[PDB]
Design a protein around this ligand. Sequence first.
Ligand SMILES: Cn1nncc1-c1cnn([C@H](CCOC(F)F)c2ccc(-c3c(-n4cc(Cl)nn4)ccc(Cl)c3F)c[n+]2[O-])c1
Length: 236
Amino acid sequence: IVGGTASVRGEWPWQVTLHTTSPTQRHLCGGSIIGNQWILTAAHCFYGVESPKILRVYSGILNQSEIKEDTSFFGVQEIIIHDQYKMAESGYDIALLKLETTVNYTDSQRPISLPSKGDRNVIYTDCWVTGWGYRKLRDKIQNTLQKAKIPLVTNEECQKRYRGHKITHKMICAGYREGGKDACKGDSGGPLSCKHNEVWHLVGITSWGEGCAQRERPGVYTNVVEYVDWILEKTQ
Ligand SMILES: Cn1nncc1-c1cnn([C@H](CCOC(F)F)c2ccc(-c3c(-n4cc(Cl)nn4)ccc(Cl)c3F)c[n+]2[O-])c1
């Protein structure tokens, strides 16, 4: 997260850190708890992941430095990638992780609601991106989870900024005209969380962008409301 600030414990309890364990253990992507056995993340996270066997899902984590050889994690039973996914920039960048067992929800591990049936025309004005990613283009994975409030932009404007890409109704963009706040390397797969009527909704999945927080180059997110039928079909 560029232009952001550190979070405190329990502030984003649906945020997870997905680690790979090959060839060495490291943060791979963010993700979001949406059910006791289900994480929603980006499909591009699994490029070159040989199988679910090498994945570890850590919930309840503020600082990456909390993760030690005895820290409890969830195994991944299945990675479910959207059938039409090819690469992040061309859409369908969404994946479900089915965990091996059920998350018992606690103060630090909670689900976030999907965008609701009948809220497709809501204008979200309180949206936040969170993650352990870079604070600049040439940086490092951060120890402490970062947060940044970012405004949504219209799909018309977003397409104008990315005339070499197909910005469809299945994407949503977010960023300041002048730049300065955005996701960056290591934030992908995590949530774009928006609060409406004091309830948090998973509006986007962090997907791709041109550089980090550049002027007139918003971050591009998978538009989760357009995938709710797909999620419900896979989680039942
Ligand atoms: C894990 N890690 N550890 N050290 C490095 C990494 C690492 C490296 N790239 N990434 C991912 C892709 C691969 O993900 C996983 F497979 F590695 C990635 C790709 C794109 C974005 C992104 C960007 N944007 C553009 C530029 Cl340039 N930089 N960022 C801008 C806006 C939005 Cl909205 C975005 F989403 C974020 N991320 O995270 C993780």
